[PDB]
Amino acid sequence: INPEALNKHIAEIIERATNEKPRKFLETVELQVGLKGYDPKKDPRFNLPNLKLCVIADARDADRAKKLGLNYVEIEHLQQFNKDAKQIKKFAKSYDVFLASKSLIRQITVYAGPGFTKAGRTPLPLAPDEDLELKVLECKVQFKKAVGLNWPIGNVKMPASEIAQNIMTTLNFLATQLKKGWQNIKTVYIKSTMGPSHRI
RNA sequence: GGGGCAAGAAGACCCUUUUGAGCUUGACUCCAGCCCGGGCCUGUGGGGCGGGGCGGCCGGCGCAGCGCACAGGGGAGGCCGC
């Protein structure tokens, strides 16, 4: 049950991995959970709660975004969205997670903001005075029709004790989401990006 | 032998009764009988198939695109010269 020993090995295999390593300990850690007593047809589905967010925002949010290092955009490609509809698929893939503006809600809501979600991207509302900076820090369950759920503990090189806190939070939450409870999950795995999986 | 509505015989016809019986069925509720399955009786052996668990490995076409994309993640570089 103790996941600490398997986490302790993670640093050891990291030695030969190398990798792209953006704010990663030479890789990204993952939690892969198998499932039992559940199928896509029935409905106890629940959606609940380096890394990046697309700052589709306005003045000040843009100024902090260049200073932080996040891409910032407004009406330039808003109108160009009318010119190309593939443009909304191109920019949704361009940013794994997105970040809308509360002030700039007006322009995207009337336009391609739900179009962004047609490909599958909904940006997160941000007034510039509210800290776009601390929203990054804020950054889940998704049974839907997927029986097998894999999430990333993160490109975390942070202490293994923090790593085990997140390995636990997801796990108690997954059971809280599963009607049987902790006995609806067949397997729990912890692994490096190109490295092998280790159990709980 | 006309009458004594002469005598038998608490009409056996037909009604009534929360009164019966015999028979019937595809009435309601059932019982023997029988058929069927498993347990017990009930020993001493030899096999074979299938499930579950494990456990290797192999696969999967609307073409749009680059081709059969099984999917959930990681992932821009690893370790394929990819």
**Three-state SS at A37:** coil
**Three-state SS at A72:** strand
**Can you give the distance from the CA of residue A82 to the C1' of nucleotide B9 in angstroms?**
119
CB A35 within 8 A of CB A186: yes
Residue A44 amino acid letter: P
- From A63, A126, A58, A77, select the one nearest A97 (Cα to Cα): A126
- Please name the nucleotide lying closest to A20, CA to C1': B77
Phi, then psi, of A163 in degrees rounded to 5:
-65, -35
For residues A61-96, one letter each, b for 16 or more C-beta atoms within 10 angstroms of the residue's C-beta and e for the rest, the string is bbebbeeeebbbbbeebbeebeeeeeebbebbeebe
CA dist A133 and A103 (Å) reads 17
A147 touches strand B (CB under 7 A): no
* Interacting residues of A76 by C-beta distance below 8 A, sequence separation 6+: none
Resolution to 1 decimal, in Å?
3.4
Which pair of tokens denotes residue A91?
């920019």
CA dist A6 and A195 (Å) reads 12
**Can you give the distance from the CA of residue A194 to the C1' of nucleotide B81 in angstroms?**
20
CB atoms within 10 A of CB A12: 9
